[PDB]
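Changelog-adjacent note: as of this version, every example in the card shows the full chain rather than a window. The one below runs 206 residues end to end.
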Amino acid sequence: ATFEIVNRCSYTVWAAASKGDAALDAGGRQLNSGESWTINVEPGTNGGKIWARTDCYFDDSGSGICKTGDCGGLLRCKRFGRPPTTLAEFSLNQYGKDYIDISNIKGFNVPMDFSPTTRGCRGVRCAADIVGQCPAKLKAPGGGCNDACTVFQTSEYCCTTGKCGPTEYSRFFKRLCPDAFSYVLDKPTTVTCPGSSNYRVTFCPT
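Full-length structure tokens:
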């Protein structure tokens, strides 16, 4: 499946793509403002994620640091990124269908649209100014808006036993972005697409 990753932000981002125990395609790349990078994701990839990283520095070996979404200091991510990270999430070719969503469960750094480029389903978007509106206790000094689990490490925010409810913090994310997961047991906003759809992830779509 192809994913065209487009940076419409006025700032550089370092795109990342991983399924948590491996890179997807090269795993990451710099995208200056306006640039597009197309990756190929294998059929059957379960639990894939794409995200933006901000404020990165990499040496000539692809080792370094990012202020949001750092994946073990690698340009080419094999692992998931350090919160806060807005997440484009997907599982493809699942009993013949693909499933896509956006999640704020690991916080928010960059606005994004995640849409099919092929027929048969809608896209999802989280493009409100979550960083600007972020509650004081969730603001990340390194940049972005943390989720409450990251900040407070409670069973209720982290949904550790699978019984949690919505919270004042999750409701903030849900108010700003109704179309994204705000906590682990949120009413799902997952879209079912035809198996083997192709996609575009756009940072700063508005």
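Structural remarks: The CA atoms of residues 58 and 64 lie 4 Å apart.
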